[PDB]
Write a protein that binds this ligand. Structure first.
Ligand SMILES: O=C(O)c1cnccn1
Ligand SMILES: [Zn+2]
Length: 298
């Protein structure tokens, strides 16, 4: 069953059982849900409402315009090179782009800034938990990610609108995430996100006021494969609009990424590289298998 971790259980006598569950999910699922994570319920409710409203007022017209312009207004055959997805990006660090998005409101912008800061603080707390589970010094992962300008932190704001013929196209094709740690505020009613575990696609259950955590390729490298980046996709449906507000805590562009030496006994099979070089390779082969990308950094 899909791991849901109650972070409030870290403050007392259940801490060891809870950390152990975090480690077990990191090893065997690559994903887990957290509850009682510190983010105000009211703020999540406001981000949810304003994202859905902005889709209706702005994104939806652009999505249908995109459909006709690619002939995707009439699905007849399988489409394996396009994602049934409506998306824009919000940059937080190194430098925010929030002031340049022309069609969002003052209240949205201010709320997104509040939300983004809180998520960045949670991302850093979660990485220290990972450090503790791995036997690394506190702040080890935060230090590796810093580079010279600090981490890269952005939010992908997506909707997966109803699709008449879901078996013809995915909402988002299977892939692993290139980056560090991913913090997803997903729709709490409409399913669609799945991960691959032990030969089966397993749904990431919609859960009110929860955050979905997963680990990217960079943590697989740093942990010497102890924590693997796992494949995931988004399927469409004929009815429903799945919301997705996914924030990515990634290394800075010039950060040197390598397996932590205390996790390496035998010579590591993972490469040492500069993060931007990984990103430039990933951009073009995102939906191809993950493992050639590690071998390509050698
Ligand atoms: O858009 C993605 O690739 C994504 C979104 N949420 C969680 C993980 N990955
Ligand atoms: Zn992803």
């Amino acid at each position: 069953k899909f791991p849901v971790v109650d972070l409030s259980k870290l403050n007392g006598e259940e801490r060891d059982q809870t950390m152990a569950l975090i480690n077990e999910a990191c090893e065997n699922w690559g994903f887990f849900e957290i509850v009682n994570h510190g983010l105000p319920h009211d703020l999540m409710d406001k981000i949810e409402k304003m994202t859905k409203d902005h889709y209706k007022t702005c994104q939806e017209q652009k999505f249908n315009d995109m459909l006709k312009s690619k002939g995707l207004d009439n699905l007849e055959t399988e489409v394996e090179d396009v994602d049934w997805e409506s998306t824009f990006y919000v940059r937080h660090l190194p430098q925010s782009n929030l002031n340049d998005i022309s069609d969002v409101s003052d209240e949205y912008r201010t709320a997104m800034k509040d939300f983004g800061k809180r998520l960045e603080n949670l991302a850093e707390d979660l990485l220290d938990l990972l450090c503790e589970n791995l036997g690394l010094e506190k702040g080890y992962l935060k230090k590796v990610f810093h580079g010279t300008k600090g981490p890269t932190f952005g939010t992908k704001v997506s909707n997966y609108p109803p699709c008449p013929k879901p078996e013809m196209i995915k909402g988002l094709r299977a892939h692993t995430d290139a980056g560090g740690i991913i913090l997803l505020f997903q729709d709490d009613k409409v399913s669609g996100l799945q991960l691959l575990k032990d030969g089966d696609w397993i749904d990431v259950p919609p859960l009110n006021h929860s955050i979905v955590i997963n680990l990217g390729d960079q943590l697989e490298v740093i942990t010497n494969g102890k924590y693997k980046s796992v494949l995931h996709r988004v399927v469409t449906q004929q009815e429903g609009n799945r919301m997705s507000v996914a924030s990515f805590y990634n290394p800075g562009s010039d950060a040197e990424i390598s397996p932590a030496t205390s996790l390496v006994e035998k010579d590591s099979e993972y490469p040492s590289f500069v993060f931007d070089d990984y990103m430039k390779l990933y951009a073009g082969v995102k939906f191809q298998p993950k493992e050639p990308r590690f071998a390509a950094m050698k």
